[PDB]
A paper describes a structure:
Among all bacterial pathogens, Legionella pneumophila maintains the largest known set of translocated substrates, delivering over 300 proteins to the host cell via its Type IVB, Icm/Dot translocation system. Through detailed structural and functional analysis, we show that metaeffector activity derives from a diverse range of mechanisms, shapes evolution, and can be used to reveal important aspects of each cognate effector's function. After release into the host cell, translocated bacterial substrates (effectors) regulate one another through several different functional interactions: indirectly, through counteracting modification of a shared host target, or directly through either steric complex formation or direct modification of one effector by another.
Structures for amino acid residues 1–228 and 251–371 of RavJ were solved separately to a resolution of 1.3 and 1.9 Å, respectively. The C‐terminal domain of RavJ did not reveal any structural similarity to known proteins or functional domains, but we identified a short conserved motif (H316‐WNRHH‐V322) that is present in another IDTS, WipB, as well as several non‐Legionella proteins. A conserved motif (highlighted in gray) is located in the C‐terminal domain with surface exposed residues H316, R319, and H320. While expression of full‐length RavJ showed a severe growth defect in a spot dilution assay, mutation of each of the putative catalytic residues or the adjacent W172 to alanine fully relieved toxicity as did substitutions in the conserved C‐terminal motif. Septins and elongator complex proteins were identified only with full‐length RavJ and the (230–391) C‐terminal domain, suggesting that the C‐terminal domain is a substrate‐binding domain. Use of the otherwise full‐length loop mutant (H316A/R319A/H320A) as bait abrogated these interactions.
Author numbering: 251 to 357, 362 to 371
């Protein structure tokens, strides 16, 4: 309930993100063009990096956690990746989001959970 490492925070975040993307108010269909999906995801991620006042109010709790600051910085980098044109499918975008907490070395999926993918 209080995430004790960055991966645990990301797991809470994934659950929230999935709920938000499945919100009926997006009016997203799985046969929509990919640009429409990617843009809706980008809007939600952007709102997340700006304090979550539009889409993340229900999950206001996560913004107080220690891990939020760094996680917001990583999501901000991904929004930049969207803006740079790195994603042509929403599937690839949510895979990036899925796996953002893992790293190489040492010191189901989001696709399946989201209806329009």
């Amino acid at each position: 309930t209080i995430p004790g490492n960055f991966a645990a925070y990301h797991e809470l975040w994934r659950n929230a993100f999935q709920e938000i993307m499945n919100d009926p108010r997006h009016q997203l269909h799985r046969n929509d063009v990919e640009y429409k999906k990617i843009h809706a995801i980008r809007t939600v991620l952007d709102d997340y990096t700006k304090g979550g006042n539009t889409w993340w109010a229900k999950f206001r709790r996560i913004f107080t956690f220690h891990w939020n600051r760094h996680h917001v910085k990583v999501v901000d980098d991904i929004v930049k990746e969207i803006d740079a044109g790195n994603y042509t499918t929403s599937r690839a975008l949510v895979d990036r989001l899925d796996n953002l907490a893992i790293s190489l070395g040492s010191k189901g999926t989001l696709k399946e959970q989201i209806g329009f993918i």
